[PDB]
Design a protein around this ligand. Structure first.
Ligand SMILES: Cc1cc2nc3c(=O)[nH]c(=O)nc-3n(C[C@H](O)[C@H](O)[C@H](O)COP(=O)(O)OP(=O)(O)OC[C@H]3O[C@@H](n4cnc5c(N)ncnc54)[C@H](O)[C@@H]3O)c2cc1C
Ligand SMILES: [Cl-]
Length: 487
């Protein structure tokens, strides 16, 4: 008989899951499996992103139960768990979504050889990206495009991405009964308290395929907003109703299919002939993701500076004090500190909010390496994506793709143009709640009388700015210009 495993790593969803469909075809028993490392914290990861993952597993668990099945959360390392459950469960086929991350290639290669010795067939469809990324490289003559313009012409020549896969059947082949490694007490979905975290999560975005689909339909409620979407024109200070889709954590974990997203976009574009075009359109935002996945997966050492062929070698400063003040949201610039507080509380900021804090840390003010700021983002972002976090940090640091280092965002003026009252600031920096609007971006410039009346004395309740922006930005521009000419 056929007994199959569907191995979840990314692609935490039932819609558009070709790996799940194949595992279910002609199957007598299907084992939906997620492999959890119970020592991961004992090694980095915030409770916000890890709880997002656990909520995504709880959602998968309810979905299989409605279909007569059960999600199995195995504890241990994949290289030590799969050889046991291959023989115990009589597995003949193993299915999982293709992954191009560096650790995934080493892990998945080790699993294929273990499956070959057990006589297990391995099926690995591509569904986390719009296209076969290796196909795009081969169609471009054997090298990935390094600009969004040439990448967009490539995908236009390739055509539409594959259509989303049909939904799985209403009833699934359940796991076999009384298998020891499938014992419910050892395969349940753990809570965040049980895995090691001591403080609760504060994010407002719930994990799961159900929440992903609900947020998707909410974005498509107004087809005019979808068709006219222009990413650079969106509001970074909007927090009650975020100006973008906030689908990034669901696309990172695969709770939402990129192909489903793309297919819904085309349906709206076909009825709206004046819809925006790449790179600013909503479809263009999925192409930025596809672009960075394509380049990073074919570039060695893509997440680092050294050994990276596309990353410029700049001698960033090693200033632990500047990094600590930026990390702890005590730069003294309320716009910067409010975004860094949103990072640690919500785990998600608007794209242009990330521009402000990334520029301030790197090429704009503090001249700290983008690798250090990345490590802070990787800890707290619920949408932390290896290739996307890498590429945009190199972009914002003028180390790759972006080279206009004379464009330096002001930590004072940038947010005032969208939000002159400082509503975003007052929400995440409630110490400045009573500061009049005239000084909320520059609290150090307020007379001492108003500081006392607002209960926020600079230097006692809120810190003074760690740098003068005019002085620091001038120095960084002059050092970036020297770096670009000594190449
Ligand atoms: C320093 C820095 C680090 C970043 N790190 C990440 C990260 O780890 N994970 C991440 O998903 N995005 C990252 N981005 C991109 C961007 O900030 C988010 O993708 C976006 O703001 C998420 O909001 P949204 O889902 O509403 O995006 P939308 O505007 O609705 O775009 C829809 C989708 O397109 C993709 N996308 C949008 N902008 C980009 C972009 N610039 N590059 C690549 N893909 C994009 C995402 O998958 C997103 O979900 C980073 C940007 C900066 C400046
Ligand atoms: Cl500006």
């Amino acid at each position: 008989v056929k007994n199959s495993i569907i191995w979840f790593r990314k692609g935490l969803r039932l819609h558009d899951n070709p790996a799940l469909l194949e595992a279910c075809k002609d199957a007598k028993h299907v084992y939906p499996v997620f492999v959890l490392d119970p020592h991961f914290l004992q090694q980095k990861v915030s409770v916000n992103r890890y709880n997002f993952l656990l909520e995504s597993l709880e959602d998968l668990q309810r979905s299989f139960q409605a279909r007569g099945s059960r999600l199995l959360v195995l504890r241990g390392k994949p290289e030590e768990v799969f050889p046991r459950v291959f023989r115990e469960w009589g597995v003949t086929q193993l299915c999982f979504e293709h992954d191009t991350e560096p650790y995934a290639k080493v892990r998945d290669a080790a699993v294929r050889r273990l499956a070959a010795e057990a006589g297990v067939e391995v099926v690995t469809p591509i569904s986390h990206t719009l296209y076969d990324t290796d196909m795009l490289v081969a169609r471009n003559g054997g090298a990935a495009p390094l600009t969004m313009q040439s990448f967009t012409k490539l995908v236009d020549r390739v055509g539409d991405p594959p259509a989303p896969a049909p939904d799985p059947p209403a009833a699934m082949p359940p796991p076999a009964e009384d298998m020891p490694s499938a014992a419910p007490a050892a395969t349940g979905v753990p809570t965040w308290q049980e895995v090691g975290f001591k403080e609760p999560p504060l994010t407002v975005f719930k994990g799961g395929e159900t929440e992903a689909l609900a947020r998707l339909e909410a974005a498509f409620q107004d087809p005019k907003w979808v068709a006219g979407f222009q990413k650079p024109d969106t509001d970074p200070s909007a927090w009650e109703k975020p100006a973008t889709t906030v689908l990034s954590p669901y696309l990172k974990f695969g709770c939402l299919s990129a192909r489903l997203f793309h297919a819904r976009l085309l349906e709206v574009y076909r009825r709206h002939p004046a819809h925006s075009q790449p790179p600013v359109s909503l479809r263009g935002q999925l192409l930025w993701r596809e672009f960075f996945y394509t380049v990073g997966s074919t570039t060695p050492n893509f997440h680092r500076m050294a050994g990276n062929p596309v990353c410029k070698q700049i001698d960033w400063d090693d200033n632990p004090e500047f990094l600590a003040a930026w990390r702890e949201a005590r730069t003294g610039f309320p716009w910067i500190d409010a975004i860094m507080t949103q990072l640690v509380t919500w785990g998600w900021m608007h794209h242009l909010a990330r521009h402000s804090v990334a520029c301030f840390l790197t090429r704009g003010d503090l001249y700290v390496s983008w690798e250090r700021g990345m490590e802070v983002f990787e800890e707290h972002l619920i949408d932390q994506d290896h290739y996307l976090n890498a590429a945009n940090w190199m972009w914002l640091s003028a180390s790759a793709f972006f080279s206009q280092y004379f464009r330096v965002y002001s930590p004072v003026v940038f947010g005032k143009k969208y939000d002159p009252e400082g509503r975003f600031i007052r929400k995440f920096l409630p110490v400045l709640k009573d500061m009049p609007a005239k000084y909320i971006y520059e609290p150090w410039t307020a007379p001492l009388e108003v500081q006392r009346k607002a209960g926020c004395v600079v230097g006692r309740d809120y810190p003074a700015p760690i740098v003068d922006h005019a002085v620091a930005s001038k120095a960084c521009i002059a050092r970036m210009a020297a770096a670009y000419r000594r190449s």
